[PDB]
């Protein structure tokens, strides 16, 4: 039971993709749901060591490429990598309400080569930032 409360560096794990599936399988088991019925909500904390909900998991070492995260609202940045202190991966019942016209889906790659996709995160953009500009600038998240 202590496996759920421990923060995990996804880069350190040998198979980071399997951890994402395991957390998805963990939440659907308690709520008697299917894995397809869970969408991944992402929350980024200012500092590590925050309140961990039952359906939430703490991940460390995620690096934001080409953007900055402030209050769960991405803005385009001219810096290379921005460290995310602690990312809470929360699994919730899917409500299939489409996007929100200010949401970008960011690939999460294992390392800088971007040769291996781990999973996908959804963030809400801020100001008048065009989500298409995020796509063109190659905004992504690195596990290590």
């Amino acid at each position: 039971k202590e496996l759920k409360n421990i923060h995990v560096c996804l880069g350190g794990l040998f198979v980071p993709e399997a951890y994402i599936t395991a957390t998805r399988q963990y939440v659907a088991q308690a709520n008697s749901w299917s894995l397809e019925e869970l969408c991944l909500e992402v929350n980024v904390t200012t500092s590590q060591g925050a309140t961990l909900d039952a359906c939430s998991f703490g991940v460390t070492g995620l690096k934001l490429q080409g953007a900055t995260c402030n209050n769960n609202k991405l803005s385009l940045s001219n810096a290379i990598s921005t460290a995310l202190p602690l990312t809470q991966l929360r699994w919730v019942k899917q409500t299939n309400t489409e996007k929100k016209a200010s949401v970008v889906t960011l690939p999460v790659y294992l390392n800088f080569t971007r040769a291996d996709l781990i999973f996908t995160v959804d963030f809400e953009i801020a100001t008048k930032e065009d989500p298409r500009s995020f796509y063109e600038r190659g905004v992504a998240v690195l596990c290590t």
């Binding site: 080409g66 001219n78 810096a79 996709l117 298409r132 796509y135 063109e136 992504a140």
Partner: protein, 136 residues
Amino acid sequence: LRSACDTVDTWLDDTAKGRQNISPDKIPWSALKTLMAQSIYGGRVDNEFDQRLLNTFLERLFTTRSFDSEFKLACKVDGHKDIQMPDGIRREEFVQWVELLPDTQTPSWLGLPNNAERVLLTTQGVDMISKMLKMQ
């Protein structure tokens, strides 16, 4: 590029049935974009995020707005200036526009951040020093 040129000619000839001036909104934008999204430049893509990037450029560049006077090929390359769509109706006008492009290309021309070339340029500059030193 050749396949895309054949596709452009095939579908433009299909719509403009031997006519002199086809309306821009009657150009088969859906046919051109989809065929390039899926088959031409699209068949090589094995990544959904690279596919989305390919779709983004095609959706921005192949519309009726491309025939407007103030169409914008790229926006804010150097923060203030940006690249305007030439108002040409003949091939020679477009070739003149290409020849008048400045020699100040930055990755912002491509939609990338301008820092994308910083490491690549720095390595080449050191590479030039190493090559010059070796030939001494």
